[PDB]
Swiss-Prot record, chains A, B, C, D, E, F:
GO cellular component terms, A-Z: extracellular region
Keyword terms, alphabetized: Cytolysis, Hemolysis, Secreted, Signal, Toxin, Virulence
The protein's name: Alpha-hemolysin
Organism name: Staphylococcus aureus
Subunit structure as annotated in this protein's UniProt entry: Self-assembles to first form a non-lytic oligomeric intermediate, and then, a mushroom-shaped homoheptamer structure of 100 Angstroms in length and up to 100 Angstroms in diameter. Interacts with human ADAM10; this interaction is required for toxin pore formation, disruption of focal adhesions, and hly-mediated cytotoxicity.
Cross-referenced PROSITE patterns: AEROLYSIN
Function comment: Alpha-toxin binds to the membrane of eukaryotic cells (particularly red blood cells, RBC) forming pores, resulting in hemolysis, with the release of low-molecular weight molecules leading to eventual osmotic RBC lysis. Human RBCs bind much less alpha-toxin than do rabbit RBCs. Heptamer oligomerization and pore formation is required for lytic activity.
Record text about domains: The mushroom-shaped heptamer is composed of a cap domain (comprising 7 beta sandwiches and the amino latches of each protomer), 7 rim regions whose protruding strands may interact with the membrane bilayer, and the stem domain (52 Angstroms in length, 26 Angstroms in diameter) which forms the transmembrane pore.
Amino acid sequence: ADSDINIKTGTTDIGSNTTVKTGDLVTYDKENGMHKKVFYSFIDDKNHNKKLLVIRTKGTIAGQYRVYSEEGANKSGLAWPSAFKVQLQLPDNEVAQISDYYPRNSIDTKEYMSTLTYGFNSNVTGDDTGKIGGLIGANVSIGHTLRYVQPDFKTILESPTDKKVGWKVIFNNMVNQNWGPYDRDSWNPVYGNQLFMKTRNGSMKAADNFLDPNKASSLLSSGFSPDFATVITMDRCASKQQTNIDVIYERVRDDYQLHWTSTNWKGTNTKDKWTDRSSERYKIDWEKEEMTN
Amino acid sequence: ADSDINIKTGTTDIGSNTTVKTGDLVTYDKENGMHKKVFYSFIDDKNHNKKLLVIRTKGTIAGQYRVYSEEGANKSGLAWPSAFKVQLQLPDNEVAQISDYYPRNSIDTKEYMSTLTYGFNSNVTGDDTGKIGGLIGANVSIGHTLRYVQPDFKTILESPTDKKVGWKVIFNNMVNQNWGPYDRDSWNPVYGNQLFMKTRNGSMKAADNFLDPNKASSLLSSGFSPDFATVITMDRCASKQQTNIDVIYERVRDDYQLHWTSTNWKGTNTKDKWTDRSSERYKIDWEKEEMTN
Amino acid sequence: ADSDINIKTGTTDIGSNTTVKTGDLVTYDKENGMHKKVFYSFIDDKNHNKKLLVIRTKGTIAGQYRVYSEEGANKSGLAWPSAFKVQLQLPDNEVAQISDYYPRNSIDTKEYMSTLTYGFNSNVTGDDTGKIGGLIGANVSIGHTLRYVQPDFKTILESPTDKKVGWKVIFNNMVNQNWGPYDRDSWNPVYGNQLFMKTRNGSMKAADNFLDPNKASSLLSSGFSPDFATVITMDRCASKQQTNIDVIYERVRDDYQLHWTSTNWKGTNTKDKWTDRSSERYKIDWEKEEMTN
Amino acid sequence: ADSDINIKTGTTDIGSNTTVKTGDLVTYDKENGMHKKVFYSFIDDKNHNKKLLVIRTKGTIAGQYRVYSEEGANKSGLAWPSAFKVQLQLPDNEVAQISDYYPRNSIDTKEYMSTLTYGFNSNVTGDDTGKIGGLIGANVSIGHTLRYVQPDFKTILESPTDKKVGWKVIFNNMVNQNWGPYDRDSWNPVYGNQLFMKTRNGSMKAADNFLDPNKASSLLSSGFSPDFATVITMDRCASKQQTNIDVIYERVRDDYQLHWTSTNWKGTNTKDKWTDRSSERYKIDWEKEEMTN
Amino acid sequence: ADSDINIKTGTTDIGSNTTVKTGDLVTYDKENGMHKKVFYSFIDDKNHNKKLLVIRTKGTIAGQYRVYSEEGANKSGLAWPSAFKVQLQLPDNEVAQISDYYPRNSIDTKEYMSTLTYGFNSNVTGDDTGKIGGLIGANVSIGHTLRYVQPDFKTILESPTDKKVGWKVIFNNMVNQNWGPYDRDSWNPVYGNQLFMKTRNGSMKAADNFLDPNKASSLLSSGFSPDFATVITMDRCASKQQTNIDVIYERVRDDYQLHWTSTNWKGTNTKDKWTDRSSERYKIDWEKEEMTN
Amino acid sequence: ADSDINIKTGTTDIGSNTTVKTGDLVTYDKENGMHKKVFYSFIDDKNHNKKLLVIRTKGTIAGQYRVYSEEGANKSGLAWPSAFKVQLQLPDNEVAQISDYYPRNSIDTKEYMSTLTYGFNSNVTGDDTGKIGGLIGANVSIGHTLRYVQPDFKTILESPTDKKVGWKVIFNNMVNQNWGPYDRDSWNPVYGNQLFMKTRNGSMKAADNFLDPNKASSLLSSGFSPDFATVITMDRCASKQQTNIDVIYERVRDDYQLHWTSTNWKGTNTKDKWTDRSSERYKIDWEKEEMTN
């Protein structure tokens, strides 16, 4: 930070003694079930070499964890969200540039532990027949331990350019009734993929053998709420002071099937079966400091 | 945050140099046992493109954990709250939109640990008859550990649109006298569901074999206090400056029955047996900046 | 800090009552996949003996983890980023000097634990034939444990001079499907290097046996975002008030090959096979307090 | 602190309503590889009985971990930094005094744990031939555990006077590929000192059997950045208002040799074989409030 | 605090809207190796019933851990600091009083853990001769664990009066090459006191068998830096406005001797062998608000 | 707090825009060894319905842990402080009331852990004579663990009235050379109470067999420093504006006796053998906002 290089806190930051023009644009895509919200802030700092627009993409993409198919009592299918995506894109003819973004990719850590034990033991054995025994023993043991945190979903900043930025929140793995964790590639020769299997050999219909959504991650059913920030820069003496920007919300859905194998349930996951894409074009007026649909 | 993109803290926030009009509306629903409180804040920031109304739903929904049925000394029933709900809804013809909400759904994590141990041991055994024996052995062990936090109740933001938003606090699982945890689907072939049974084979009346409310979650008897925030946006030059909004409080009650099976007690839980719903219509005057019932 | 030597906080910091001139310069190198961003701040504090320019190098270097070669079904190659580098360099004829930098190299710690246990046991055994036996035993064990944190990538400040400063983020080690950790030098006589092996003996094409990028560090595929800071000083009454500075972004790529050995897969890693360099020259005008390409 | 003795926070600190004169002096010693930086602050507080100069010594001393000798394929030598030192000295005829310094020596702690466990066991055994046997046993065990943190390098304030102050950062111990930790005095009859030994019996050139610098502490190769502070006091009505001060940076280098003993590698460390010393004299003008070389 | 009794924080503190007169007095005792520093603050708050002088004693008492005696290859002695002391004393004829001091004695805590385990086991054994045997067993175990922190040195406020106050930092115990901890009274029949024994039976000179000072607490060799605060009160309308105060720094040195017992080394510690006292008299002028030697 | 009920922080606190009159009264009782200090604050807030006096009792009560009796070499006695007390009392005819106090009694917690493990093992044993044996075993284990913190001394607020308030700091239990903890009621048939015995069977004088005060809690020898706050209210329009208050400091001392039982040492503790009590009457003038002896 600034204090690490002997500089007062906030000295190098943008936006002091500036009037900031903020706004909210709200859309609801009913077919895709996406509540999209753009919170924008225009910052024209006289001491900064460019004009800034901060765009925060928020809202909620519904998970839509849903049993969608019932082929009798022995086969069923469940659609579930394996990824949520948010993308911002400027057309290539624009002179505005994507300057900053948040959050970014972090370096993950793990804790390592090493152990070395050694010991000696000895005993003497008695008896009422006068038999006397003895024993002397020694042992050594070496151990290694690895500890780390696994989230249910991972937030990843995809490789940005000066015209395009994006984030994806992807399914990592989940605990199923204290078992697991299972992921999209877990395989068992007997039961297949047990991601959303409720019982291994229950006698109910297949449509009733899926994990209850309250027992899974809330992102699967209620959905994910993005909170992403992009900073777009514009030259002050540019000829054209109007920009277009596209914002895309996305949901990728996998297909998890349960079928009865005459002795137990077997699960099978198919990746990226469906994609729901909701796009919206916005107009930025830099001189008026406003954003519209 | 702002400091992550080289921007002064609070630069992009709403409500600087603004007069905020606050208010409280309090109702008590005696039949449903709900103390409903609405704390509203009108923010008309000149630098923001819309008028904001922040509505905080608060109060308390009583748990109403109570023994409701006694069919002799051998069977009894207990009504208990498995869910609390808060919903806000705007009518279809309104111009105002639901812009923001809090809290949202967060990604939950788990801690994973793996262990690998290997060791060698050796011993020599003597005897008084000159018998000498030896032993050399080796061993290897692999372990996996999973750790995570389990709350008694989960707070879930249900999928919002621009016209309605909702939260639900649902029962997750509970510890019964250091045993468990048990949930609404726990089943034992001998005892059934042991969520609220006090003794496994006590010889008292069934109505006296339910877990004491002081030994359970305080949400079950004393109740739950919502603290939820919604932000509603309105255009400044809209023709009509009056909005209607519905606020609904809900309590879903399960039915837990104990009966004597001639050897021990057996428990059975029935889900969503009752629903208490208390609705209230409010009028928002944007020009006067007030809310009324 | 200042309070440790009885001095008010921030008393000795630079930049009070100063007008700071900030700016952003954004480039996108399409061939190298590098989004380069320079955030500069000119600080001319009258109470400081020199003019300061703080340069923050930011942006994102894409990882570009990708399968690049398929020699049939039994051989494949994967290019992956083992290092990301950022360098700033002043020409030797300049009079401006590199004054400060951040982050720097930290001293790492480990936690040590010692254990000493001793115990005694005894038992008596008796059969129905009047056989009575005894046993008395003692044991002692000594243990040592070492615990420390291992990041996936390490950030290192390379030894700076007054003309050039640099950072490198280098691959340390990675967990592969709860196994490992593996690094660039892990070797197994049977399987070779298992850094990005998906299955040990799976029967599939070699190009399909590499670890999924979602299951690895996000730095490998999506890439790394630099956050480095340099402080450059300049004399106030210097004759020439123009400086040149070179900023270089680098990506070093290793080559991980999988091949079928008729029984199982074997992986070999080749270090520093490719290097992608993206250099950019900037002009610093100290009088105008501006920075240009 | 002040609040512990009922005094407003910061009441007794120096530097309120004072103009502070700061400056930077940067030197690069190419022969010794030392980037030396002095950040000075002159504080003349009217309410303080003396003039203060705060000198912060910063910069970076390069580690210079490097293979320096190759006597064929069976012998090699590595020079590595075992200590970094920073010293400030005033000539004995000066009237200025060293008043304060930071950091200082802190008291280290350890965590102690005692355990006492006892138990009883019993079993009954029975064969198909009517043989019945019993066993009753008891045991007791006592354990002691000690836990503490061990940094790779220790920073120590050497005993100051009113004319000279100094710090040294010295090598403590290091983990070598999850083994150890090893220090400068570790000895093993078979392998000698295994501080920087890569393989115990690998068949390669001796120069290629040293631990890779990326797998060691970053201080060994990239180097150490001092962050030390000294406070010098001077009387206001002294006749001579000019002071001289010497600042010295030092690097002590050990010599680690690997040689082949026809069966395995053996390592030997020689302490304090080389010393690189970089000295610089500065002139302090108290009335002009400036510092020069 | 104030907020606990419904009072604004800082309301009851001293020193608001007050001019504070601060000063530094620095001495170096070369014979005793003590850098003594007094930082004083005069606070004359009009709303307080007395004049306050805050005296902070700082500086550094050198440890002076050194081998002082060699009586051949078989006997040696080492002087080491077992205590550092700081005392302030007012003459009994003074009317100023010691009113406050910091730090004070804290209440130390320990963590207690109780464990109770019980279990059952069973097994069946069968060989090729038809011999079938069984075993059923049960066990119970009770454990207690105690955990607390042990600093190397303890800081103790000695019982103050209104005329004298004092602190002592005393040696508590130390880890010797991962063994111990050892204290001044540790005794082993074979080796005596092993506080600073390097090797138990090494064949070297006795003077070379003492623990290296870099492997011990830095307080032992480099020394201890006091940071103690005293508050003196004076009546405003007192006839004489001049006070005398004595400040004493002290170092107590123990004598640790190593001698060869023809089989191994034996250590012996003698307590409080030497004491070094450095006393200084200061004059306090309450009218001029200054302190002098 | 205030923010929990939608109220600005500090809105409801006392003492804004108020002139506070503070003072210190210092006494030293030499016979009882008590340094008593009263720090008072008069607060007359116009918006508060009463005048407030905040009295902070501070200082130090010396522990006075000391050997007081020696009856030959086989019997000795030690006086040690088992309780420190501070009491404030208003006469019953006063109009002023005790309104608030700090600290108060807090609810203590414990951590509970339950464990259930079960396992299976198998065994196949061979021989050179062709004898083959097998074994199949199963086991189950249940465990409970309780963890909580135990301080050496407990601070307790005794039941206050409107005229009387008090605190006591009482001895809880102590660790004796890593054994224990022991308390005033610990009893062993062989050794009695081992609270302060240094050796169980050492052959020395009884007066030399007591634990070293440096190895015990510092409260036992150096003593306890109270920090207690009382708030006294008074009506503004009252006839008499002078109050009296008594402040009492107390130390209760137990008597720990060691005697030789011809085989080992035996300790006995006698509770509340001595009580040292020092009282002081203070006059409060509410009009002058002054407190005197």
